[PDB]
Amino acid sequence: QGQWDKSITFGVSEAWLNKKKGGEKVNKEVINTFLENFKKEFNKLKNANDKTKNFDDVDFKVTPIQDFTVLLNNLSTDNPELDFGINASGKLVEFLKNNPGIITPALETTTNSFVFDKEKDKFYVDGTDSDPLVKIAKEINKIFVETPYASWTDENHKWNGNVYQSVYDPTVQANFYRGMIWIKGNDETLAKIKKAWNDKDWNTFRNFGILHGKDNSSSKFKLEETILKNHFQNKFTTLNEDRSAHPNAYKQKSADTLGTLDDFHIAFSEEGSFAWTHNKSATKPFETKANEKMEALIVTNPIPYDVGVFRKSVNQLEQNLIVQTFINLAKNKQDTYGPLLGYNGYKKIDNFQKEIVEVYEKAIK
Ligand SMILES: Cc1ncc(C[n+]2csc(CCOP(=O)(O)OP(=O)(O)O)c2C)c(N)n1
Ligand SMILES: [Br-]
Ligand SMILES: [Br-]
Ligand SMILES: [Br-]
Ligand SMILES: [Br-]
Ligand SMILES: [Br-]
Ligand SMILES: [Br-]
Ligand SMILES: [Br-]
Ligand SMILES: [Ca+2]
Ligand SMILES: [Ca+2]
Structure with a gap:
């Protein structure tokens, strides 16, 4: 089941976060708007449902991450200071081949077609x-x-x-x-x-x-x-x-x-x-x-495009509400972060082996 965590921290690229335009930390501002929109939609969903309305309300934060190896290694420690991040699909598949079930894929991003x-x-x-x-x-x-x-x-x-x-x-x-x-x-x-x-x-x-x-x-x-x-x-x-x-x-x-x-x-x-x-x-x-x-x-x-992955012990109900929050933010055009990375839509992963692993393996054959 996993533990409900009243503080959720997303890993985001260090370079991106501390990057600038005009001497200004532009991305800081984008991420704060995103986090506020995320927190509001998440807790609305959370509190509208008997299954989850009695848990603590959740705060959302970001932490800079140097590169994907650090993301996947740190998520694998299952430390509540880092709960989720979004990773390239192939690299994640190769990591999980080596470390099966150590972290939990949950979100599939999609991008505007060329x-x-x-x-x-x-x-x-x-x-x-x-x-x-x-x-x-x-x-x-x-x-x-x-x-x-x-x-x-x-x-x-x-x-x-x-x-x-x-x-x-x-x-x-x-x-x-x-x-x-x-x-x-x-x-x-x-x-x-x-x-x-x-x-x-x-x-x-x-x-x-x-x-x-x-x-x-x-x-x-x-x-x-x-x-x-x-x-x-x-x-x-x-x-x-x-x-x-x-x-x-x-x-x-x-x-x-x-x-x-x-x-x-x-x-x-x-x-x-x-x-x-x-x-x-x-x-x-x-x-x-x-x-x-x-x-x-x-x-x-x-x-596949990038995949959102959780540390293993985040409560399943919370994971699914976080996935739906991504989906609903995209739908209501409140996602100020994703499109800067190419993430123009989101889906729940229902079957990681079928939807991600098999697709990746067919491509490298
Ligand atoms: C607006 C925008 N669109 C597209 C991209 C490119 N992009 C973001 S996630 C993704 C898929 C994963 O690619 P990458 O992280 O380069 O992993 P690799 O294929 O090197 O393993 C790509 C192509 C971008 N950085 N910015
Ligand atoms: Br022009
Ligand atoms: Br709130
Ligand atoms: Br609320
Ligand atoms: Br529900
Ligand atoms: Br590269
Ligand atoms: Br070379
Ligand atoms: Br290039
Ligand atoms: Ca946490
Ligand atoms: Ca030329």
């Missing part, structure tokens, strides 16, 4: 022009390359300080996201990369240089590794093993820096990362040399 990827169940087939993942990449290129990202304006792609709204369909919630593989070069180099892909010439492809995220990343490492393995069958075992024998062919960097690196021409990223990346940023994101272009090659198989 106009180019509104259907979850599209998977790798053969890497040709007719491949569903290749078709999405071509739709991305119509948005990012044909209408060049560098010339997008806040006004004509509806930048709202958060995302370019014009690349989304808010009326459709996606209970998934994907990674993607970018390629960059002049015309001759792009053709050579595409030829190597088409010919399944892994050595040649790989030697164009691959940028990636950390090896525990789903969307900047593992999902793309799966596509490459499924495409260039028999040519390698794992990306880590391949890198250990070919180290100058790999570098850990964000895809939006690909254009700055002359010895790298392939990069992994979240699908549509440009959609929340302001093109005016001083980092000059996605900039390429004058006679080079960056374009999508293929996206990956889909996995």
